[PDB]
Amino acid sequence: VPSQKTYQGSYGFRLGFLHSSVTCTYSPALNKLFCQLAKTCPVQLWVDSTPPPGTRVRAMAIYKQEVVRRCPHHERSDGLAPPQHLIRVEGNLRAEYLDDRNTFRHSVVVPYEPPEVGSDCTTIHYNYMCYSSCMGGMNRRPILTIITLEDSSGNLLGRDSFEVRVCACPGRDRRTEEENLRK
Ligand SMILES: [Zn+2]
């Protein structure tokens, strides 16, 4: 099972989020992102110092409590992300879709890019292609997205993660879960 241990590492790597009708909303209290199917999910990459050129950013989904993949229905597109992949990157011409030869787990990698002239963090846009409730897919089991900062050889430089619930009413479900957390 892929490690989900938070690791800021030498560059002080950690994630930040943005609220995007609600299509995407993040709960700091639950460290959980609630999002609609296939909509833009802005995830920010924050570092204290800039990693070396050739640095890469990998996103992978795992069950919080077995490979995470789309249910048969949602496998059926940009012609880049394999139909079985739950996580897709939006607006990046250099996304690589990978399947581990040993664990069969899917992941999508993009080159790490320093913040834009004026901005303090790097934003990557992700899309989740199947619902948390999908039978034959996640079937209501909670999942986690693990983001790893890596060197050109795949060595770990940093790691952060967040739970994700892909659902039809992100704002409503976030409120329900936070209220219940409070309860
Ligand atoms: Zn599905």
Swiss-Prot record:
Annotated effect of mutating R58Y: In a sporadic cancer; somatic mutation; requires 2 nucleotide substitutions
Could you say what the effect of mutating L149V is? In sporadic cancers; somatic mutation
Q: What does the annotation give as the result of altering R70C?
A: In sporadic cancers; somatic mutation
> Result of mutating A61T?
In sporadic cancers; somatic mutation
Effect on the protein upon substituting C41F: In sporadic cancers; somatic mutation
Consequence the record notes for mutating E96K: In sporadic cancers; somatic mutation
Recorded consequence of changing V117G? In a sporadic cancer; somatic mutation
The observed outcome of changing T145P is: In sporadic cancers; somatic mutation
The outcome of changing D100G is:
In sporadic cancers; somatic mutation
User: Changing E66V: reported impact?
Assistant: In sporadic cancers; somatic mutation
Q: What is the effect of changing P111T?
A: In sporadic cancers; somatic mutation
- Pinpoint the Glycyl lysine isopeptide (Lys-Gly) (interchain with G-Cter in ubiquitin) cross-link: K183
Result of mutating E150G?
In sporadic cancers; somatic mutation
| Documented effect of changing T103S | In sporadic cancers; somatic mutation
Impact reported for V164A: In a familial cancer not matching LFS; germline mutation and in sporadic cancers; somatic mutation
Outcome following mutation: G9S: In a sporadic cancer; somatic mutation
**Outcome (variant: R165S):** In a familial cancer not matching LFS; germline mutation and in sporadic cancers; somatic mutation
Question: What result is annotated for mutating Y63H?
Answer: In sporadic cancers; somatic mutation
Q: What is the effect of changing S161G?
A: In sporadic cancers; somatic mutation
| Known outcome of mutating T145N | In sporadic cancers; somatic mutation
What is known to happen upon mutating Q65H?
Answer: In a sporadic cancer; somatic mutation
State the protein's name.
Cellular tumor antigen p53
Q: What gene name is given for the protein in this entry? A: TP53
